[PDB]
From Swiss-Prot, chain A:
It comes from the Viruses. It is found in: Virion; Host nucleus. Keywords: Capsid protein, Clathrin-mediated endocytosis of virus by host, Disulfide bond, Host nucleus, Host-virus interaction, Late protein, Phosphoprotein, T=7 icosahedral capsid protein, Viral attachment to host cell, Viral penetration into host cytoplasm, Virion, Virus endocytosis by host, Virus entry into host cell. Belongs to the polyomaviruses coat protein VP1 family. This is Major capsid protein VP1. One of its GO terms (molecular function) is structural molecule activity. Changing residue 238 to F: In strain: Isolate MAD8-BR. Homomultimer; disulfide-linked. The virus capsid is composed of 72 icosahedral units, each one composed of five disulfide-linked copies of VP1. Interacts with minor capsid proteins VP2 and VP3. Interacts with host 5HT2AR.
From Swiss-Prot, chain C:
The chain holds residues 26 to 289 of 354 of the full protein. Signal peptide: none annotated. Changing residue 50 to K: In strain: Isolate YI, Isolate TKY-2A, Isolate MAD8-BR, Isolate HER1-BR, Isolate NY-1B, Isolate N1, Isolate N4, Isolate G3, Isolate C1, Isolate CY, Isolate MY, Isolate AIC-1A and Isolate Tokyo-1. The lineage of its organism: Viruses, Monodnaviria, Shotokuvirae, Cossaviricota, Papovaviricetes. The intrinsically disordered C-terminal arm interacts with neighboring pentamers. The unstructured nature of this region allows to make different interactions depending on the structural context: pentamers present at the 12 icosahedral fivefold axes bind five pentamers, whereas pentamers present at the 60 icosahedral six-fold axes interact with six pentamers. This is Major capsid protein VP1. Changing residue 237 to F: In strain: Isolate MAD8-BR. One of its GO terms (cellular component) is T=7 icosahedral viral capsid.
Length: 259, 258, 257, 258, 258
């Protein structure tokens, strides 16, 4: 791909605006945005998590205006987590901080991630415990070995389906993803506080060091996210993941390319 | 609106300065700035918070000198939380840190937010628990469904009334608010320390990437805030939200539009 | 009307000093500490003794007499003095655990400084409007329940040392045109003192128009609070501990109309 | 070496891409990436850690395209920890946070380190306790004395073998390593949270103040890493180190030298 | 002294490279780098710490190539703590984190400090408790009064002796030290985690706002340091300070003065 000039004029730009909902497991008809309560296996060999207990990567494939060559180039991103103040509900079936106290807030292990690409996010599998039996309905590293706990290059995949790729099994593949920009932070600790910033004044530039953003193959833009904010502790002590939606606004421009 | 040139001259600038007081619930005649003690429902379905237990967004609509087409354009903001040192009162009916110790300070879950716009802040509803029954006197997401726990686009509103829009139900709508600049941080954990900075030397510029600030429709400036600082724990262990007022100073200039 | 800066060797001067903390000083051996904290049974019965209340520190420094010319404050170097004293964890402290070292000073802190050409202007805000403040302090008068969030009647000047309690007062953002102030409350129960020292860091005091505080009557006002946290003695009782703050201000002669 | 001009043209650049796996101890055939459970000696004098309880530095020597003079000069680095999300497995034989709670995450003392050089990383030995008996199969500071607890200049080594140099005995020697760029952070506390950032948008420039990067002697590039993420706590309360692999992408250019 | 031009040419620059060992108390022949276990006095009046329980400032005076007026001017500094990974020894007579857990790491109150000057670092004394009886062999504030707890300008000294000036009694005097650049951070809390960064890519410029670095009187360079990393907790619960050495590399140039 030789990348040539940017098109100009009023017609040369377009914008994508949407929200990606979290896929935390949704264990019943009242618990969208939550996982099933966590159960712990007795041994590594008996680890067998149910599907509704496993948060998954969110993805949307957004068709863009048909172009044909020209390709849509993703240039800027505005993004934030939607509903951050919902975590101030500390009066709803939560374990109390202490006797007579308020409910505990969502807190602890969190992963906040987003990517913008001109094709599906490329994934590499890494397993905490290679003997984990992952559930029907999920897409997980196959033919796992003990080496899968550190790096097994067999575990390559595309984030190409919603509610399918468990967060704990998969990361962006740093050896690929030339046509995607990804950003993620694991804040892994037991007691970490959610720290969530919102503003409509912050922009992320998606251009690489050569001034080129993701180029959208077949006129499709791929947005991906995970926003596991922490765990909710209910009155029994049981804990569930809680996720929130992520807003995306992407500005794109037409770019001529060759080959 | 085609935005044209800025007017110059002595007459062309004005400034707005004020305090927005917090709306934490005010459970009795002595407890302005606090919420009611927090009680916890035994199920999601029975979550039924009383009005005086729910912090709300603060809003002020500030009339500007009448124009007329010229519009007042908001260009800069100075802001800070007022009364930060009041949280050093650790001697007033607080649960002790330990036997013989000082009173516990306000701490834990906090939300600090402010916005400046030329019209009401536009809101999107998101619910922790869609089955929460919000109380009379509040304005809250209607026709809630389980999808409201993550995103239901029916829940659109304007922050157009003080003491009314509960903080926990509503956020700035990122799909709108073209004519407002908003800024907020949730620091959500149980044990988080208030970290509150004050200074008269810091300015936030409100101009967008094209050099245009909020334009005040009908010559009204809208300021909105939330400053839930954390929770105060009294000697029984009961906990209540504590908030503080926010100072705003906004500089505006006259801008011609078509 | 602010006109040109005077140049020449005679045209600059510098002020250097320490402001000591005013934490309450409950006896002849406890300078820098407050009285141990006692807790009221109710908001209505809150009645803190004077020696339990840290206050704002202030110094008015005379400058070389001029005369219109005014001294203009341009730069500030500042730091807390004696940060390492908080490593005394062997002096009547509650132990971390059985056989452990003494607990260090920690918890709720407020670090604040200002440089101005006149007294720092204060606004009152009260945690609890029914607090009875003690004789010897200067506190918000005619307090009402609105004083807990904002009562614009509570205006004052920081014009006396050992008198304005930290918990009652903050810099008034609606005034202080002729002062630059900087403060941080780190309010939590377990927060660690994080105190940096260096002689290489300078704060510029000029506003966006290039004008620093102008010293009325050839006086410079320095104000500070450095409540570092609380010390816990072996009984579990807790008291505020404060430290002194160093100021070095560079000033230049400025003509005004 | 006198460093002269950079070569240009399409053939003047090359790239190295790989991952270094962690060497945490691997106590059995199922526990790659973990150490043996941590035990504690009764005294300093009796400290004798097992080989499989001691994380080691990882190293890879990467042959580059043959050049001859010209040398490959390392100019940029992209790097990140691979598999950060695996730490969200809180359902696999972990000690519960509290009764009925989720499993505890990996947390506590961590060391994250990487280097890129034109020759082996040069090491200096520093011992927590000079009487520690390091195990057969490891390469450790020899002729240790009480001064080795602060600085004993006898303890010099090259990171020239895998599963050999224990992390706790060795650091980069700041008195050497002219031809290497190294970066590391110890976050030492008992309760510290892993904070692990990933992105493909971040580059580190490896040039020194004179615009010269590591020069690869014998056309070999040396990559070294440690990523001890914290400790995993199993249901018994026992704790073991958990590490993750590190990705490296290095861009190099031909430089003439005399 | 008037500061005039920098000398140039091959002969005009030199470099100093060394390490300063920590002076934590060294309570016996096996415990270099540690203090004696901390004991707590019953009252302020009875505070009487033993010498081997008091960490002290470290100092080295380094001779430079003889000049002559030319003076060596210190321009840049690279520095880091040496042996950061030794703090991963959590298997040697430590108190366990919990039942069956690993040993506790070094953590809690820390002070990391370094300075570079053309003469001895100038100190100001401040005491936590003015009635503390400081031990023979230490140099401490004399004629202490209650004012010494906040500021007693009588307490002036020079850091001109190793293993002598207790860290807790003394700080850099900000009213002096015109010919020294100093940097320090107290991280004072009971549970603070050591956060120790190492890299050979970071430089601190020592020049003042007029572009002048420390000028080395008598061709001597003064380096000073404290790196109290926290406390180690042994199995009995007793706690002792642990320090580490600090690397310095300073680049100097010849400067003419009149």
């Amino acid at each position: 791909v030789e990348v040539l000039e940017v098109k100009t004029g009023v017609d040369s730009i377009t914008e994508v605006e949407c929200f990606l909902t979290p896929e935390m497991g949704d264990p019943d008809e009242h618990l969208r945005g939550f996982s099933k309560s966590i159960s712990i296996s007795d041994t590594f060999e008996s680890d067998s998590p149910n599907r509704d207990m496993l948060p998954c990567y969110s993805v949307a494939r957004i068709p863009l205006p048909n172009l044909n060559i020209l390709m849509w180039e993703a240039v800027t991103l505005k993004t934030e987590v939607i509903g951050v103040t919902s975590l101030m509900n500390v009066h709803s079936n939560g374990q109390a901080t202490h006797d007579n106290g308020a409910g505990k807030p969502v807190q602890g292990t969190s992963f906040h991630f987003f990517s913008v690409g001109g094709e599906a996010l490329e994934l590499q599998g890494v397993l905490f415990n290679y003997r984990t039996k992952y559930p029907d309905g999920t897409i997980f590293p196959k033919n796992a070995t003990v080496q899968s706990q550190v790096m097994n290059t067999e575990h390559k995949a595309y984030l190409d389906k919603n509610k399918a790729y468990p967060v704990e099994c998969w990361v962006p593949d740093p050896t690929r993803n030339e046509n995607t920009r990804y950003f993620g932070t694991l804040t892994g600790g037991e007691w970490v506080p959610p720290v969530l910033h919102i503003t409509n004044t912050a922009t992320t530039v998606l251009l690489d060091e050569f001034g080129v953003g993701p180029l959208c193959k077949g006129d499709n833009l791929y947005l991906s996210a995970v926003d596991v904010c922490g765990m909710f502790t209910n009155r029994s002590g049981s804990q569930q993941w809680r996720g929130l939606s992520r807003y995306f606004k992407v500005q794109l421009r037409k770019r001529r390319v060759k080959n």
